[PDB]
Amino acid sequence: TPEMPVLENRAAQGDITAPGGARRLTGDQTAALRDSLSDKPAKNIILLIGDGMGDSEITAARNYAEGAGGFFKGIDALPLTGQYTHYALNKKTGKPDYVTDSAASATAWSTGVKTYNGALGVDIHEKDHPTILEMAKAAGLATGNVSTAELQDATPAALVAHVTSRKCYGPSATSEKCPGNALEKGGKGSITEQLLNARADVTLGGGAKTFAETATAGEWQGKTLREQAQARGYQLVSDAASLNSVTEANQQKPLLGLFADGNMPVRWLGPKATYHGNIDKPAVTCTPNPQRNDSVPTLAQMTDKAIELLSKNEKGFFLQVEGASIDKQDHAANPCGQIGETVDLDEAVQRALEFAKKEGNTLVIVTADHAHASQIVAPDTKAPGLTQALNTKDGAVMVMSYGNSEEDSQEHTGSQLRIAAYGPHAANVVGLTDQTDLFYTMKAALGLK
Amino acid sequence: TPEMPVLENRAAQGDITAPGGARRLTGDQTAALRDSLSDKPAKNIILLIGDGMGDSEITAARNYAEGAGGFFKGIDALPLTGQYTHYALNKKTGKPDYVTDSAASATAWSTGVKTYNGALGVDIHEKDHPTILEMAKAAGLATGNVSTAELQDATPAALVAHVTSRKCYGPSATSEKCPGNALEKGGKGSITEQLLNARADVTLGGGAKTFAETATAGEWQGKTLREQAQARGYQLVSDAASLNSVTEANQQKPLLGLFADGNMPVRWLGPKATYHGNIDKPAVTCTPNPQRNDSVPTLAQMTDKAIELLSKNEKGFFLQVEGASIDKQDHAANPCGQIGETVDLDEAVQRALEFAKKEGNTLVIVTADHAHASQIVAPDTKAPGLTQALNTKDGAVMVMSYGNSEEDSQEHTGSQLRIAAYGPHAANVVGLTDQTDLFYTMKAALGLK
Ligand SMILES: [Co+2]
Ligand SMILES: [Co+2]
Ligand SMILES: [Co+2]
Ligand SMILES: [Co+2]
């Protein structure tokens, strides 16, 4: 039912070289914003995270894919916006650590407590805290966790695992790096073992490799984690046909989709940026990655499937969806891979908003875990790092720069960044907020105890 | 009490290492946001521009001066926030130029038309378009133009000069670089000549150097631009005592405060960042500039006086205040200089919000012309550019990196950035908008017919 509006168009309205032609607005917004404010309960929440998707990453993707004056029909369409802070903490001192990793930030919105880089579901004293997904399930809501990364990666793992190091994917790494969590030492187990215990109704992503490990203790000792999932009643799917065939997902038959051995394939291919890449080389045009395929569900397809299965729960549901490789390609100084994964996320955001606008009691939030390296610079820039010129939709060149690491991976950055929302309680993302306020916002919107 | 609320406190509410201790919100914001929405006329508008003040610059300055969980009482206190685009145009092709300079962006919000880099008050066809200040004056409102830069500099110059290159400060520069604008060639003249013609009520800043020049033609041929200003009824002040002695500023008594020959002094000093500076040099604590003075009005002081003098006009006033050297210090890879000028701007914003909250019909907007180079990165970063470690208010180290230029000056960046507002019609900065939308928003809120 239409009541709260989703923005229909914020593209430049006309000829950008003419007076008024670059305007994104067509009239006053006071009434539209009033219509966007409701404090009624959120029956459902869909939280979409672009990993590393700072304002710079949004702008670069929009400039390339949609044109400077273009509009992301998903990402740019949420009417209530603000800027939030995502600093982590130094484990020893408890003081702020100004640049977080994916684990401490996902732990912050999923538990409401700040923590140290690399921690999942625990605070600086390594004490476990319940996550918004575990809380939703406990309250009888359906739950979904979707990501284009390995499911053991920090972002999706924070919702279902409590470990002292994000490296504890399976039994082997846990025994070596998180001895206190190792199952054979009396702990709760590896990230994959804890994910199997958490039992969200719908879990979709990559990361099949770790399921080949076998447990070192417990009821399923000696069996692979895949065998364990099967013995525990999970429906396992591995491709788009398998996924489409699923008709239900619930506690009796939870769904686990493992679509790649490690990360899922990126949407677009292009070369890595290089030293004086914008002065020494010709411009790059991105191209679709052949490895995608009709056999691999897209992030928008996984999102739609999750929504269809979780919406069957009369009480409501919580769903987190992660466009994971925006960050990974930004680390790899690869504009095409980075931008393609941002376009990918925009499609999933559109599916979420289409659902939310019709359902009327769904709060949709779109943001990032932290900012990143990429910068949009003048075409004639002579920079010390890695740069690349790109042919955009506008038929002009845009140059991107990665200038914060001499090491193999570009670095995260600490800038506050955009958080946007639509639906019941969306006012709580406007103005300056902290990433831990998002936990409390989601908890209150759902009316959780 | 002031119906429209100013955010009182969005600092972290407690122990950031404890659950909820880093929250900036104390409860639901739906009602507060409803109370912040009004479409009544803006009687007055105060536009504050932090040149180069992207989200990264706001965050770095907050982290250093207020701590990561701190709160800028001015900058962070506006309740309605969005992200806006500021791309310029390639003059020859008319397509977007993804990274603007100060001239094209200030032309965009002051005229509503996109333009090429370096252009002031003209489009890509070199055609003049009226500025919001010129229009405000024509309508019977009082007008103020305040900046810590030279008054010929792009930001304040865009409100009163129409020239094909921002370099046309005076007669000499104009005759060689903007032959078509040179007075002795029939044009409207240099930036300073046009500024004297525009005759705003209150003009305060630096740039007295150019006034030594003498007109090549016109009624004041042979006289220095300063002699000319005196000759045209201008009330000239040059220090703080002379300025805070002025009791009135109007058309027969326009005020021209020239407080420095070039740019006004920055607040704080520190070493410039250097290669591997966060690794090879000690962390830095910023030092107060001993030559910043007590006979030189601060930005907050110039803002307050301008407000006192412009508010006597019953119809209303338009005032633009620029914290100009955030950008200039970012170009110089100087974190302390940059952060201190951001702190300086925050003080001016507090004065504006305090007045606006009492007055009730004043729209205040805080934003920047474009983004910039500085990035916050991990303490152990090994970057190819210039870096520096800083001792923050939290008693922890923050490292900043400038990595997009091997040249003498760091580069602007193209990322969309925060725009925030308070007062009538503030809803028009929420969500995604363009810098040219801000012109239409100001014009319409004042009801300039
Ligand atoms: Co991340
Ligand atoms: Co991630
Ligand atoms: Co990362
Ligand atoms: Co600028």
Ligand SMILES: [Co+2]
């Ligand atoms: Co400026």
Ligand SMILES: [Co+2]
């Ligand atoms: Co600049």
